[PDB]
Amino acid sequence: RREIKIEGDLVLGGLFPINEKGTGTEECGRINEDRGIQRLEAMLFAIDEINKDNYLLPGVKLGVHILDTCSRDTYALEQSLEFVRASLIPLLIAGVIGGSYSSVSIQVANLLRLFQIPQISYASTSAKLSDKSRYDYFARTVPPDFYQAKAMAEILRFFNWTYVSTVASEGDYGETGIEAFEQEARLRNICIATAEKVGRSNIRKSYDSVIRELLQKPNARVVVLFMRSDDSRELIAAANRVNASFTWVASDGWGAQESIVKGSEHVAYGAITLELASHPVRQFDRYFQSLNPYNNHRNPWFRDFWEQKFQCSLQNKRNHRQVCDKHLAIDSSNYEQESKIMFVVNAVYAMAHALHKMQRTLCPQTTKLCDAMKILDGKKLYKEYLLKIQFTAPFNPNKGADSIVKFDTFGDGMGRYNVFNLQQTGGKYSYLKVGHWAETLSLDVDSIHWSRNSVPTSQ
Amino acid sequence: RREIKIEGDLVLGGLFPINEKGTGTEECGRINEDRGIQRLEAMLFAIDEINKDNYLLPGVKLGVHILDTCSRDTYALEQSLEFVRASLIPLLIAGVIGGSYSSVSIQVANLLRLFQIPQISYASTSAKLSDKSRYDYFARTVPPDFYQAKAMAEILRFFNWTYVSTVASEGDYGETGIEAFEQEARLRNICIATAEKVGRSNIRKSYDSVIRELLQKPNARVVVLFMRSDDSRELIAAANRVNASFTWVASDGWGAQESIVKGSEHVAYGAITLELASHPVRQFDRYFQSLNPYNNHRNPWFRDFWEQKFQCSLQNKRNHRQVCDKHLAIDSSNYEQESKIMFVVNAVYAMAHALHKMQRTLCPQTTKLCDAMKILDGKKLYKEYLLKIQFTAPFNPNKGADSIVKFDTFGDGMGRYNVFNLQQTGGKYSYLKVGHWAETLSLDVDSIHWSRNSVPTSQCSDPCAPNEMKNMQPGDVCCWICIPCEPYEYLVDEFTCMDCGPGQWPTADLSGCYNLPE
Ligand SMILES: *[C@@H]1O[C@H](CO)[C@@H](O)[C@H](O)[C@H]1NC(C)=O
Ligand SMILES: N[C@@]1(C(=O)O)CN[C@@H](C(=O)O)C1
Numbered sequence: 001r002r003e004i005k006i007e008g009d010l011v012l013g014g015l016f017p018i019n020e021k022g023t024g025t026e027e028c029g030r031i032n033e034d035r036g037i038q039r040l041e042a043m044l045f046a047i048d049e050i051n052k053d054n055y056l057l058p059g060v061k062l063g064v065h066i067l068d069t070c071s072r073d074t075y076a077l078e079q080s081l082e083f084v085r086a087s088l089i090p091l092l093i094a095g096v097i098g099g100s101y102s103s104v105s106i107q108v109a110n111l112l113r114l115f116q117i118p119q120i121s122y123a124s125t126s127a128k129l130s131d132k133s134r135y136d137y138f139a140r141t142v143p144p145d146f147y148q149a150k151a152m153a154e155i156l157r158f159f160n161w162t163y164v165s166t167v168a169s170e171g172d173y174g175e176t177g178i179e180a181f182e183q184e185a186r187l188r189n190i191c192i193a194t195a196e197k198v199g200r201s202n203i204r205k206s207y208d209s210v211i212r213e214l215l216q217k218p219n220a221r222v223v224v225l226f227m228r229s230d231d232s233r234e235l236i237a238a239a240n241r242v243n244a245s246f247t248w249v250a251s252d253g254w255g256a257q258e259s260i261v262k263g264s265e266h267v268a269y270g271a272i273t274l275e276l277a278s279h280p281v282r283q284f285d286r287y288f289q290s291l292n293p294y295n296n297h298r299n300p301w302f303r304d305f306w307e308q309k310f311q312c313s314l315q316n317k318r319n320h321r322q323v324c325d326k327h328l329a330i331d332s333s334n335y336e337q338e339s340k341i342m343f344v345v346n347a348v349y350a351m352a353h354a355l356h357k358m359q360r361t362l363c364p365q366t367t368k369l370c371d372a373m374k375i376l377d378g379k380k381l382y383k384e385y386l387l388k389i390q391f392t393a394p395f396n397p398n399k400g401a402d403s404i405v406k407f408d409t410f411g412d413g414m415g416r417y418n419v420f421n422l423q424q425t426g427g428k429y430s431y432l433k434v435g436h437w438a439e440t441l442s443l444d445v446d447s448i449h450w451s452r453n454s455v456p457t458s459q
Numbered sequence: 460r461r462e463i464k465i466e467g468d469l470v471l472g473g474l475f476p477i478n479e480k481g482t483g484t485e486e487c488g489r490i491n492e493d494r495g496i497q498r499l500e501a502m503l504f505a506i507d508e509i510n511k512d513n514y515l516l517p518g519v520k521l522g523v524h525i526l527d528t529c530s531r532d533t534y535a536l537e538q539s540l541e542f543v544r545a546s547l548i549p550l551l552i553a554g555v556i557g558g559s560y561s562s563v564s565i566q567v568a569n570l571l572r573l574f575q576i577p578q579i580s581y582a583s584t585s586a587k588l589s590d591k592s593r594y595d596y597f598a599r600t601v602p603p604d605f606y607q608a609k610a611m612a613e614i615l616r617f618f619n620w621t622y623v624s625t626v627a628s629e630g631d632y633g634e635t636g637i638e639a640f641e642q643e644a645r646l647r648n649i650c651i652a653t654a655e656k657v658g659r660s661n662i663r664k665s666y667d668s669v670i671r672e673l674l675q676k677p678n679a680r681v682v683v684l685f686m687r688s689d690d691s692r693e694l695i696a697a698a699n700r701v702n703a704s705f706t707w708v709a710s711d712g713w714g715a716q717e718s719i720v721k722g723s724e725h726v727a728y729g730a731i732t733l734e735l736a737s738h739p740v741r742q743f744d745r746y747f748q749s750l751n752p753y754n755n756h757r758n759p760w761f762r763d764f765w766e767q768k769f770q771c772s773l774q775n776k777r778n779h780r781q782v783c784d785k786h787l788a789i790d791s792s793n794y795e796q797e798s799k800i801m802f803v804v805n806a807v808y809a810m811a812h813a814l815h816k817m818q819r820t821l822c823p824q825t826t827k828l829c830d831a832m833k834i835l836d837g838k839k840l841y842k843e844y845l846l847k848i849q850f851t852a853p854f855n856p857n858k859g860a861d862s863i864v865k866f867d868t869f870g871d872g873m874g875r876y877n878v879f880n881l882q883q884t885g886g887k888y889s890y891l892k893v894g895h896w897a898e899t900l901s902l903d904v905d906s907i908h909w910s911r912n913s914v915p916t917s918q919c920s921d922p923c924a925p926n927e928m929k930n931m932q933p934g935d936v937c938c939w940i941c942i943p944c945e946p947y948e949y950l951v952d953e954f955t956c957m958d959c960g961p962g963q964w965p966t967a968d969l970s971g972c973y974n975l976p977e
């Protein structure tokens with residue numbers, strides 16, 4: 001049971017899928033490197049920054065209480081109990097920054113509302129959450145799948161892929177996300193071959209089973225994927241053991257993760273995956289790359305991350321091979337900033353700018369946490385929060401790109417996605433940006449390298 | 460922070476408004492005597508009984524973990540966190556028996572579902588809870604207000620009280636409960652004069668304010684009340700300071716509590732209040748009356764209850780007057796069993812019979828808690844629970860009165876309500892049962908003692924003058940104007956004044972025309 005406790009004048013809860021969903025009786029598996037450890041640090045970074053900042057919450061140091069969600073909802077839920085219990089050693093939570101998988105953001109939202117705690121997700125995208133009548137204390141800095149589904153169908157409708165198959169992760173994410181695609185699919189005259197869907201505690205046999213059925217309709221060479229990062233790997237893994245080949249069209253769930261195609265660099269070749277529109281946070285880069293087990297002591301998971309990333313081994317381990325070189329480090333050769341890290345940082349600044357207004361509004365005299373705010377008014381903070389608008393943490397170069405954080409009447413973000421193509425040119429697999437989606441598709445077509453190096457056909 | 464912990468092979472949570480909602484920064488006010496302390500004890504009693512019982516959960520002693528809800532939702536909610544946390548000193552909760560105010564049963568339900576814990580209320584009545592898509596782990600042994608509102612409207616529709624005023628407690632109980640009456644009200648052609656509603660942290664001024672407004676429509680002498688026990692008292696309190704008088708028609712919220720009219724025995728006289736149909740649990744009577752501070756040590760609130768009920772004082776107190784006689788006791792002169800106590804007991808037995816089945820089903824070999832049930836399957840227990848049917852804890856004499864506990868497809872109970880009349884005959888105020896509601900009203904009318912000892916009247920406009928006038932309707936259906944007619948025209952009907960014509964005249968009563976000579 002590892003957590004992160006940094007005391008402060010005001011505290012923010014944190015939820016990150018630091019560890020993958022553990023198989024069997026256990027709950028937490030291997031370290032999620034890029035979407036777990038990075039995103040986590042990103043929050044620490046953002047806090048660090050908000051504390052070093054003078055024009056945003058100065059007399060109110062921001063403390064954090066971060067918990068791993070081990071990619072499982074029921075688990076994060078239990079963890080989250082930590083925050084509501086913290087309203088009565090206990091940390092007075094102001095807002096929770098969290099919910100990577102939609103699956104857990106919801107399960108968590110269902111509890112924070114009962115205790116009026118503002119939640120902000122930096123990645124959950126299920127349209128289900130937009131419903132501000134069931135998730136009245138939730139907000140996120142990313143747009144719902146209702147706008148990604150469109151982006152997806154409009155990609156097939158452009159390549160006359162009238163007959164394609166769908167397979168979606170079980171769970172509020174994949175489900176709602178596909179039900180979104182299903183609709184947008186019919187409307188553009190696209191018939192769905194076989195409707196596949198994986199699930200929980202699933203092993204190889206259930207994934208191969210899905211591959212089989214994707215093969216029982218060999219007319220549809222284009223398979224649409226609305227699956228979680230994990231279920232999206234197990235699928236490709238299966239599809240590879242039996243040299244099965246298709247034109248993969250996947251939701252951000254797969255996104256541009258090069259860690260999904262690892263071990264099947266080809267069975268996934270010439271695929272098309274979408275991701276959210278984001279511009280890397282310069283400072284975070286230098287920040288993360290500056291980390292190492294000798295200076296990152298506040299992150300209890302760092303060691304395990306270190307040993308796993310470098311194939312290391314140490315005394316604070318079990319019993320393995322190859323000890324680890326001191327001159328080992330995170331550099332530009334072993335690290336690429338995760339796509340959503342931007343959303344993490346904005347999520348936090350939001351919460352902060354939100355509090356920051358409450359500060360100056362409720363307490364004119366000082367810069368410190370007065371008596372007015374000794375005990376926050378959740379409801380208030382949340383309807384003094386949505387109404388937020390600010391220039392993305394200055395960690396952003398431009399300003400003219402609507403790079404300002406704010407929320408809709410639903411508390412969600414702007415639907416800007418990037419279209420990707422999985423290609424390899426020099427013995428190495430990489431993702432190349434080939435168009436995007438603003439409200440209408442776009443892509444330099446003659447940029448795409450397809451499987452069987454030919455523009456596919458699915459009718 | 461006081462709780463009750465009795466260890467056991469299986470444990471049941473408990474929520475009771477033992478203390479009234481505290482005013483100011485504090486949270487818990489005075490002890491709720493009859494709906495708090497009694498109902499609490501009734502649960503203990505029921506447990507005590509289920510443990511002394513041989514044919515129902517024998518090898519599985521039932522433990523309880525009871526927490527006061529201080530009548531506040533946000534508070535019970537926090538306390539309830541005690542139970543979900545208890546699924547991981549911590550007590551393995553099987554189900555929570557609780558939720559007096561609807562207000563809190565909901566707020567609570569919202570949390571137990573997140574951890575699959577079966578809840579059962581012995582009194583929350585909000586229709587909102589019937590919705591098994593939002594409260595999938597809730598059940599109760601009382602029927603939704605959807606059936607009480609009907610019973611209420613049907614009581615006014617019988618006394619042609621076409622124009623009456625409504626005032627409802629703020630909070631899921633009063634609100635939803637009135638929205639229920641509002642609808643059933645329109646449907647029976649009943650216009651609502653002024654729609655009043657009290658609230659939170661409300662003091663005298665907001666109650667008087669409500670009285671004032673009830674007075675700004677002095678045509679409606681009948682006021683409908685869908686208010687919590689507490690808000691229902693503050694209102695009458697207010698209504699009394701200013702000798703205001705009406706015919707009070709109140710929901711069970713007020714019910715038949717003689718503790719509501721205390722201090723205004725007359726400003727509330729000749730009122731009509733509804734309650735759930737229930738028959739007192741004989742054994743509980745002997746049981747409760749057998750309690751006293753020297754033998755009730757497991758109930759941490761007992762002393763405070765004792766000191767408060769008897770005006771006592773003790774060393775485990777603050778600093779007051781008049782010490783307390785040892786020979787003080789709860790007898791037939793100072794105690795009347797609360798109306799819902801029955802529901803409390805059934806609520807628990809249900810939970811028990813439920814577990815009891817799970818016991819014999821999951822574990823054929825022994826009578827004890829086996830490995831199959833070491834860790835319960837909420838979802839399962841809940842859909843092995845609703846499907847329950849049993850003869851009310853034998854604490855009931857008859858059997859032929861559908862006195863069997865069970866739940867609807869919604870997890871609610873049977874809508875049977877009793878109609879009451881608040882009357883005083885010998886210097887003492889009491890509640891007299893005067894009819895009930897099965898699915899249709901009923902009441903021996905000539906049983907009711909009204910205020911101004913006269914069957915009241917609540918309509919919009921006065922009746923027309925036969926001698927002349929005709930009924931005229933502008934926009935609504937309760938408010939009309941009386942137009943007199945021309946000495947030469949009769950009335951085809953109540954509303955239409957029709958002219959007789961040439962060489963004729965309308966009869967004296969104005970029902971026809973008598974041919975004139977000359
Ligand atoms: C009003 O109530 C009286 C009860 O005495 C009844 O006789 C009368 O018919 C009612 N008015 C109508 C016609 O609705
Ligand atoms: N689209 C994701 C979700 O809403 O759950 C799937 N994976 C999440 C992530 O970025 O890690 C985002």
Ligand SMILES: N[C@@]1(C(=O)O)CN[C@@H](C(=O)O)C1
Nearest residue numbers: 494560561582583584632712
């Ligand atoms: N019907 C009540 C409720 O659910 O709120 C009103 N008063 C409660 C009580 O019995 O104390 C029950």
